[PDB]
Amino acid sequence: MKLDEIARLAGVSRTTASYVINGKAKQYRVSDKTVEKVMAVVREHNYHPNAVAAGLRLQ
């Protein structure tokens, strides 16, 4: 379930859905509106990013 389908199935764009796939919605401009909208599809299909991601400190 690539970014493309998750965007069309949820109802956003290849990047707006990209926000929702990585859990970055608030960082961009989809604080909730697209979270439940696109996250419901990202988690329905279980689509997640690959290993090794920037965040060694993470607070």
> Phi/psi of residue 2, each to 5°?
-50, 170
| Number of Cβ atoms within 10 Å of the Cβ of 41 | 22
Residue ranges of alpha helices (H) inside the chain are 3-10, 16-22, 40-45
Count of C-beta atoms within a 10 Å radius of residue 33? 12
* Phi and psi angles of residue 21, each rounded to the nearest 5 degrees, phi first: -70, -45
- Residue 11 contacts residue 39 (beta carbons within 8 Å): no
For residues 7-16, one letter each, b for 16 or more C-beta atoms within 10 angstroms of the residue's C-beta and e for the rest, the string is: bebbebeeeb
Domain ranges across the chain: 1-59
* Amino acid, single-letter form, for residue 23: G
**17 torsion bin: left (phi>0), alpha (psi -120 to 50), beta (else):** alpha
Return the CATH superfamily for domain 1-59. Answer: lambda repressor-like DNA-binding domains (1.10.260.40)
